[PDB]
Amino acid sequence: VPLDGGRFATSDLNDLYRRVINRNNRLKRLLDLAAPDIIVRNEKRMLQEAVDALLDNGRRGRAITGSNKRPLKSLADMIKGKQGRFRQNLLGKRVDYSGRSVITVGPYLRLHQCGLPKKMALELFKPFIYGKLELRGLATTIKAAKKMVEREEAVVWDILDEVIREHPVLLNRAPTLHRLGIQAFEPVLIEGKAIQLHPLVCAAYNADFDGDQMAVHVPLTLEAQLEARALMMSTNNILSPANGEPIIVPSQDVVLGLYYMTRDCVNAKGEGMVLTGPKEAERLYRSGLASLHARVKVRITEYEKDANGELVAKTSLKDTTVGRAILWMIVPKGLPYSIVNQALGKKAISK
């Protein structure tokens, strides 16, 4: 490789081969004069040590050095070590079609989608954009196409919305330990310049928001898209393969939330009354005539599938807390009621 200046970056194999060839030519010249044999012995010894150097510099005695102080690299090192070919260019290769950025939170997302920044996208899916362009017939060749996508005119952004709509992507974090370490998502375009990522996964990634970095990846072929959707989309991982406990455990604020939302004092506003339904419960709490927690008798109705896989209802007058009734409007059809009639710490919500 040529350097900046009238010099050249010295390699190692070059120096080694050159040494061997010098020594060989000298010996060849020596076998014409029939010099005394001690000389040719010293010669052969030099040559043997040199070929030794070329094949493995560092296995005989003191290894030959190079420019400054260090053993120049030989073929044995080309293959060995943490920096030979195996562990550096055949088990993990750098890869095109990617990018990286900083993460933030953005809690307005459903957990099967994640943010992404416009500029990153328009740099990623350049081929797709080219294609849809000359399909809709806006530029003859690829030239005007690339000129348009650099100038960043109007229609490109609409085109990009049309091509991202259902095209999953992969997110990666650096110390990948267990196979959660790579999950999938669908993009939703954002402004700014930093990936937005759902909260309920920052436990599986083991990734706080203190300035970490995440990498993107874009599948190209069609089998690949279907792989990423049917196997690695985030919805299909709610259990660590280590052990059957859930991994979508709500983490650290949401828990304080639910906690303060369900508890009981002994005496607050609106204590000692009766409510026809969780609906008017929430209505009270919004209007501001009843405290957020005060024990109350209310009516609730619950479902149970005790039949041959069939749902059956039953209703009654439970004794509970107003906030707890408000929480009730989210439980789906099939659970019992006692699951949400206590403190709701962390273990509780987990089970």
Binding site: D96, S101, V102, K119, Y130, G131, L135, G211, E227, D253
Partner: protein, 1319 residues
């Protein structure tokens, strides 16, 4: 009393402990060391004198001629710091050497035939140190780190346990000199005393023992003691000192005076020894059993035979007894041995010895040192006489000598640089004695054995290496002398010296690139103590216990400042009050203690001396008279800590600050935080980016004034006086009367430093801080620097903040920030990048810098000139063209802005290699710089003359005034007139000659500066012209950055809400930042909450004053109110009183207060809760420190009132746009057709091994295939892939990878045959 320029903004102060030793000059290490390096000094003693007087004189091979030294002298640089930073040369200096050559006659006394003295021969160049303690090599600003390594001397170590798994510890001893080879001693489980020279194979130490020309008899005499037997006609009876029966059990009955005293086979008390010594008898008979175990000392020979009768170091037997008896030998020498007292280790070693004499021993050592070499008498002689006894390859230090005698209980502390037989013998004695049981090992980590070098010392060593190489050369050449015709320039060639010193200051494990982006960052990078470097250990191949703190780091090394990660403990920062002892240990101050008073006399102490005394902790309640209010007190004695008595202590702490570093003393309320977070806090604070408007942090620690004033970015004055002229460029100070020198009296001029470049791409700027007509006192601020203000150190800004979760957006640590911040531009930062285009001259054609370019429209071309370089001020964007460069074939190679940055073009530089035509633009810039320099120096002369004429006038008024005759003739020449016969006339003549000298000086400097600028300076060979262009981006703030506290809570700003939605308060104000409460109990740093409260109090006082001032009142109200605000507490130091502030300064004081009443807090003596409460009560906020709020969206009330207050926050330089990155299809590496790595090189990410494991874990396969085949390796693969993508058909075609093909080739390179096979 107070300085006049402190009265501007007097900083309220809590704290109790009266301080007695003000903070010293924070840059002692660097400057004192280097000054010591280079300065004229007699009698050698650590300068260039040292190196020279060591190497010279240089004598021929008795060639009757010899070279010697006289005196050295420097000159003065051709350039100076500013020009140098611009151009790229080193800030260097000439070096001249006066040498003397002399010649003697052949066959005569030392009669000088002839001598000559070359006129100060040139040699080499050495860099100087800028007044701020930084070096300047190549347009950059490097720094050298003080190094911490093991002291020269002797050492005794255990290496307990692990070895040999036998439970029996070992003991080894090492000698490490300052320049030479090593030397060791150690035992083995078989109890034998072995030696090794320089980590090589092992030997029995007797080899070198007798290599010192000793006989076995002498060796035994040295080590062991004597026991005698003589011919008393039967068993050849004995005499014995009863002391030799110390705690023993006799194997034979002890009889004397016909009286038995102890039973045969019992232990013996000391009363027995007492009574028998009182008896005073030694003649005793012995049995034969007690005999055989002994060993002969000397060798007996007989009259007739004289043959091998007895060999020294041999045991006994009755036959030997009979043999020596029948030969008639009176005396019998033996060896007093034991098991718990005297192990006969030397005798065992001797029995293991294979050697016989000095000759064979030298042979053996010569053979083990260099394998495969012919043993030879002179060879071994001259070898072993050159590893422990000659100046050539071995030398300790004075320091080495001091330690080496100290650890041997010697008497004096000055000797030779070499070893001695006596010394080695004594070392081995000490080791044996340690094995016996008395004495103790000495651990390494104790700072009495580490040592701190510095720039001066290391420079001296390298320069010495240079001198010895040049003397090799000089000796070589001088071996071929001539007839008097050569002169001392052929006898010298400095190129090796230059090579050595350049190599050191340029490329070495210590000289490194200065982190210059924040004043604090500088001043804590210069004071860095590193354990790495040539002469020290390594990063991960180094020990463990050195990475640990030791109970003697106290006050000499920070506990809590070090980068985490791959190298902790190795990069200890240096303490605050630490100094450098004469020999080079770490010494700290203390206060002397008399009988019952804490006297006010300081006293410096070293490491080892500390161990013997007893030392009193700082925060101890004294009472005004040195009396400790208790009679017991917490103190430390020897790595201990325990309550002691009253009349025992002898030294007390100086202040309380002395257990931290400047890097971590700015942390208010430090003591309430853990260790971990204090650490991360100091480190983050070090990375603060400057701002565009600094604002005096509220909760400070009083250690700001020094940290700023002395870190020489702000411009300190030198002679107090009256400000005469102000302007963003320069400041012009008139001097007072009596702080003046008689000649060249004049006035001082300060050239500030306008917008220019850092080394981390930040904007180093300066701003005036005074106005016309304003007195200034010596040693005071005049120019604020980057992130400074009014002198004090400021890093970020102070903002109103409230702790409460708020709709998720602060989920984990995500700070939230309201637009009220991004409007006022109170985090806007300024960055500057620097782009370079070059003009090579390659065969097939030289390059071009024209404007005309093929295949580009008028769009890009319009911004360019008619010459090819962008105007000074265009607002270029990403992709545009700054310089037009083309390569003939003609191809475009113009210079374009890297994609992403906006900005503006603030400045352009042009360099041209001499011998080439110039363009139009370079000529124009030349004329510009000429004109400016001329005007500048003309103004210099004009204002200086103005001051001098003013002084003349002021003088003529005294002693011969002519008020009317003075202004008759103009300012032209007021010396036309005369003065009486007085020294005032002498003074007039002084002034006149100074005026004429200034005339001539202006002339010469003008001409010289013109000549400097005119020429085309040198360059790297093979180049024609370089163009450099600057840019100035203005990055504001946007979701993704990293703002931080100081206590150590990080965060990534995440949304910018509109003004409305921030939770407001009942009085109406919004709030600006909303952190996450759950972060506080987790990271146990309770501090930031107290910081918040105290800040709330501050701003309370502030707003109160602002109201009182806006409703303009009589000043007396302000007087009283500020008075109260300043008293407010228990006994303190401050004791200000505004009864003496001239009734006008008060107003200006209120002016600078209306933003807050800055409170200070020393580190371990800070404000307590009660005083915080009472300050708040002086305000009007509620005592609880919590307020109710009102959420903006719902417009209703939160519950359970929350916390608000001002929490000074910082910004780090991990901005988002230096991390966002993406690649689709770019370059490709050359060897293995793979995509490149990094960002600057427009490459892509890395798909790691563990990730391949993950994808295998899922069933996904096609993803992995095209992840490491189509997107990386197969050339045909990705071409096909691209062509198919452009038309909808999503489908790959794998093919074979290529890196694998390379693997095949490189294995085939060897004798191997690897192949593919049949299909």
């Amino acid at each position: 009393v107070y300085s006049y320029t402190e009265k501007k903004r007097i900083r309220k102060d809590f704290g109790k402990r009266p301080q007695v030793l003000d903070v010293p000059y924070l840059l002692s290490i660097q400057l004192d060391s280097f000054q010591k390096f280079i300065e004229q000094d007699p009698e050698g003693q650590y300068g260039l004198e040292a190196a020279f007087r060591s190497v010279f004189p240089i004598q021929s091979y008795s060639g009757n001629s010899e070279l010697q030294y006289v005196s050295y002298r420097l000159g003065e640089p051709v350039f100076d710091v500013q020009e140098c930073q611009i151009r790229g040369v080193t800030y260097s200096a000439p070096l001249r050497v006066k040498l003397r050559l002399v010649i003697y006659e052949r066959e005569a006394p030392e009669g000088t035939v002839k001598d000559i003295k070359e006129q100060e021969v040139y040699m080499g160049e050495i860099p100087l140190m800028t007044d701020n303690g930084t070096f300047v090599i190549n347009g950059t600003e490097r720094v050298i780190v003080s190094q911490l390594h093991r002291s020269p001397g002797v050492f005794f170590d255990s290496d307990k346990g692990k070895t040999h798994s036998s439970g029996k510890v070992l003991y080894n001893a090492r000698i490490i000199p300052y320049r030479g080879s090593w030397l060791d001693f150690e035992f083995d489980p078989k109890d034998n005393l072995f030696v090794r020279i320089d980590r090589r194979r092992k030997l029995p130490a007797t080899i070198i023992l007798r290599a010192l020309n000793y006989t076995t008899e002498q060796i035994l005499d040295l080590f062991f003691e004597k026991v005698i037997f003589e011919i008393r006609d039967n068993k050849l009876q004995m005499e014995l000192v009863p002391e030799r029966l110390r705690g023993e059990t006799a194997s034979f009955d002890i009889e004397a005076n016909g009286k038995v005293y102890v039973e045969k086979g019992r232990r013996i008390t000391a009363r027995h020894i007492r009574q028998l010594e009182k008896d005073d008898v030694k003649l005793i008979e012995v049995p034969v059993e007690y005999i055989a175990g002994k060993v002969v000392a000397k060798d007996y020979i007989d009259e007739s035979t004289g043959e091998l009768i007895c060999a020294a170091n041999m045991e006994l037997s009755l036959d030997l007894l009979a043999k020596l008896s029948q030969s008639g030998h009176k005396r019998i020498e033996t060896l007093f041995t034991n098991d718990l007292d005297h192990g006969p280790y030397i005798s065992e070693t001797l029995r293991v010895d294979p050697t016989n004499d000095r000759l064979s021993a030298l042979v053996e050592i010569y053979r083990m040192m260099r394998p495969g070499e012919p043993p030879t008498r002179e060879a071994a002689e001259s070898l072993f006489e050159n590893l422990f006894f000659s100046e050539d390859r071995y030398d300790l230090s004075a320091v080495g000598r001091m330690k080496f005698n100290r650890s041997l209980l010697r008497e004096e502390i000055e000797g030779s640089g070499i070893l001695s037989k006596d010394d080695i013998i004594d070392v081995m004695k000490k080791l044996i004695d340690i094995r016996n049981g008395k004495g103790e090992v000495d651990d390494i980590d104790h700072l009495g054995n580490r040592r701190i070098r510095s720039v001066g010392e290391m420079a001296e060593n390298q320069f010495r290496v240079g001198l010895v190489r040049v003397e090799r050369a000089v000796k070589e050449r001088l071996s071929l002398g001539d007839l008097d015709t050569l002169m001392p320039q052929d006898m010298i060639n400095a190129k090796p010296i230059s090579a050595a010193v350049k190599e050191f200051f340029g490329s070495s494990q210590l000289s490194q690139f200065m982190d210059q982006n924040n004043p604090l960052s500088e001043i804590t990078h210069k004071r860095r103590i590193s354990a790495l470097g040539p002469g020290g250990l390594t990063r991960e191949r180094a020990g463990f216990e050195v990475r640990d703190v030791h109970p003697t780091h106290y006050g000499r090394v920070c506990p809590i400042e070090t980068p985490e990660g791959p190298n902790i403990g190795l990069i200890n920062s240096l303490s605050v009050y630490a100094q450098t002892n004469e020999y080079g240990f770490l010494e700290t101050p203390y206060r002397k203690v008399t009988d019952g008073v804490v006297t006010d006399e300081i006293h410096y102490l070293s490491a080892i001396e500390e161990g013997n005394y007893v030392i009193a902790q700082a925060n101890s309640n004294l009472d005004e008279e040195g009396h400790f209010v208790e009679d017991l007190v917490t103190c430390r004695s020897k790595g201990e800590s325990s309550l002691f008595s009253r009349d025992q202590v002898d030294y007390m702490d100086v202040s309380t600050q002395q257990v931290v570093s400047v890097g971590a003393s700015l942390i208010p309320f430090l003591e309430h935080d853990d260790a971990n977070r204090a650490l991360m806090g100091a480190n983050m604070q070090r990375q603060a980016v400057p701002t565009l408007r600094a604002d005096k942090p509220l909760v400070g620690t009083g250690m700001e004034r020094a940290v700023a004033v002395d870190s020489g970015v702000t411009a300190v004055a030198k002679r107090g006086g009256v400000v005469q002229y102000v302007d963003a460029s320069r400041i012009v100070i008139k001097v007072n009367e009596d702080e003046m020198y008689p000649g060249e009296a004049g006035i001082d001029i300060y050239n500030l430093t306008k917008y220019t470049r850092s080394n981390q791409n930040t904007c180093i700027n300066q701003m005036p801080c005074v106005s016309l007509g304003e007195p200034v006192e010596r040693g005071d601020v005049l120019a604020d620097g980057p992130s400074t203000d009014l002198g004090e150190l400021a890093l970020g800004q102070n903002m109103r903040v409230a702790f409460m979760p708020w709709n998720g957006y602060n989920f984990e640590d995500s700070i939230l920030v309201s637009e009220r911040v991004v409007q006022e531009d109170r985090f806007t930062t300024i960055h500057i990048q620097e782009l370079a285009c070059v003009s090579r001259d390659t065969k097939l054609g030289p390059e071009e810098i024209t404007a005309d370019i093929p295949n580009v429209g008028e769009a890009a071309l319009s911004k360019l000139d008619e010459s090819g370089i962008v105007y000074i001020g265009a607002e270029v964007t990403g992709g545009d063209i700054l310089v037009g460069k083309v390569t003939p074939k003609v191809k475009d190679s113009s210079l374009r802005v890297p994609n992403g940055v906006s900005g503006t073009v603030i400045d352009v530089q042009v360099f041209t290699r001499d011998g080439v035509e110039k363009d139009k633009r370079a000529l124009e810039i030349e004329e510009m710089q000429l004109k400016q320099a001329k005007k500048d120096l003309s103004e210099e002369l004009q204002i200086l003359e103005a001051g001098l004429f003013s002084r003349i006038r002021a003088v003529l008024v005294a002693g011969g005034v002519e008020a009317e005759k003075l202004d008759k003739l103009p300012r032209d020449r007021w010396l036309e007139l005369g003065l009486t016969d007085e020294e005032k006339q002498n003074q007039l003549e002084q002034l006149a000659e100074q005026y004429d000298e200034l005339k001539h000086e202006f002339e010469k400097k003008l001409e010289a500066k013109r000549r400097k600028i005119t020429q085309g300076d040198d360059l790297a060979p093979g180049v024609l012209k370089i163009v450099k262009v600057y840019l100035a981006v203005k990055r504001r703030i946007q979701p993704g950055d990293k703002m931080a506290g100081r206590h150590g809570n990080k965060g990534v700003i995440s949304k910018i809400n509109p003004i409305e939605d921030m939770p407001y308060d009942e009085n109406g104000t919004p709030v600006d930042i909303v952190l996450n409460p759950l972060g506080v109990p987790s990271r146990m740093n309770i501090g930031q909450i107290l910081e918040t409260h105290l800040g709330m109090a501050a701003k309370g006082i502030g707003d109160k004053i602002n109201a009182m001032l806006k409703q303009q009142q009589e000043v007396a109200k302000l007087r009283e109110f500020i008075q109260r605000a300043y008293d407010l507490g228990a006994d303190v130091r401050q004791k200000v009183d505004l009864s003496t502030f001239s009734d006008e300064e008060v107003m200006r004081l209120a002016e600078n207060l209306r933003k807050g009443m800055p409170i200070a807090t020393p580190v371990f003596d800070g404000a307590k809760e009660a005083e915080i409460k009472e300050l708040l009560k002086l305000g009007d906020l509620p005592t609880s420190g919590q307020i109710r709020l009102y959420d903006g969206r719902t417009g209703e009330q939160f519950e359970r009132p929350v916390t608000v207050g001002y929490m000074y926050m910082l910004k780090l330089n991990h901005l988002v746009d230096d991390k966002m990155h993406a690649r689709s299809t770019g370059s490709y590496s050359l060897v293995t057709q793979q995509p490149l790595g990094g960002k600057a090189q427009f490459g892509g990410q890395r798909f790691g091994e563990m990730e391949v494991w993950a994808l295998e874990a899922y069933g996904a396969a096609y993803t992995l295939q095209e992840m490491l085949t189509v997107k990386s390796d197969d050339v045909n693969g990705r071409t096909k892939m691209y062509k198919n993508i452009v038309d909808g058909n999503h489908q790959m075609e794998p093919g074979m990878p290529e890196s694998f093909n390379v693997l095949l080739k490189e294995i085939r390179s060897l004798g191997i045959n690897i192949e593919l096979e049949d299909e």
